[PDB]
Design a protein around this ligand. Sequence first.
Ligand SMILES: *[C@@H]1O[C@H](CO)[C@@H](O)[C@H](O)[C@H]1NC(C)=O
Length: 303
Amino acid sequence: LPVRLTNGSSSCSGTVEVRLEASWEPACGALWDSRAAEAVCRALGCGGAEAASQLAPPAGAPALLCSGAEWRLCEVVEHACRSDGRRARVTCAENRALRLVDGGGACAGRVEMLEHGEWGSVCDDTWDLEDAHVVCRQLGCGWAVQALPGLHFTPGRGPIHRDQVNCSGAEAYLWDCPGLPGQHYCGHKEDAGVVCSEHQSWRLTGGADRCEGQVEVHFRGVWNTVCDSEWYPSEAKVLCQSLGCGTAVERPKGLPHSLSGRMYYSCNGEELTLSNCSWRFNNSNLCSQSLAARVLCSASRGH
Ligand SMILES: *[C@@H]1O[C@H](CO)[C@@H](O)[C@H](O)[C@H]1NC(C)=O
């Protein structure tokens, strides 16, 4: 009012935008000194400015001119910069962020939060699906499957930003929820975790050991089968390598699809995991007459 921060980590971070009579336009990358960064961060109510950056996107645009480090001394100009040029970005002192660590891939792991330039963990006391649902939506992983307690994933280090969290469910961020700070009540043994809908975990059931059997995948909070139509050595090489059982040896004939859903994959061969490949979940055109794909790796007792 009349400044805001969009497409960033929080409401106190991201690309700078200025309000006009027509619509909100991004601020100019040039003419963006640290004086204007302080004035904008302080006016929004986000404390001081930690760092100012200039990002490039893949009539003219407005700019923010300030004679001092205050909002009263700042002035907006209508046209004084090239339109399709580098924009202005900023991270204030009150900026917060969120990350999941040690969870065998993206959209899962230990819930870590950023507060005043320090990555800290959240306690498992009063941790439920209502708190996990807020975490999965802000990151872009859909809904929450399981709100895990401590010791499921590796415990964190450093500070503990929350000893108790009680989200209603509709909050945009985890920091907006009512809670209690780090008062030495909880410890790193109780570091909370989460499993979101978009996370992908794999295993091989049916065979002699862990690196042999039916290719199963945990997507959308349910175990699913893999289509044998597009299951060639390129896909099998990525699977046996990610699980850690060497190269692929054989791809036996599958059984009918007997789980919640069906998964499709199309790898080049050099991927680190099957989630990095091109995939489509529950596609009737690609998967119909197919069977549940299988694989036999090198490290198994069967080979
Ligand atoms: C936790 O949040 C719910 C609303 O989701 C509220 O009814 C309840 O009183 C809160 N717990 C405490 C201890 O205030």
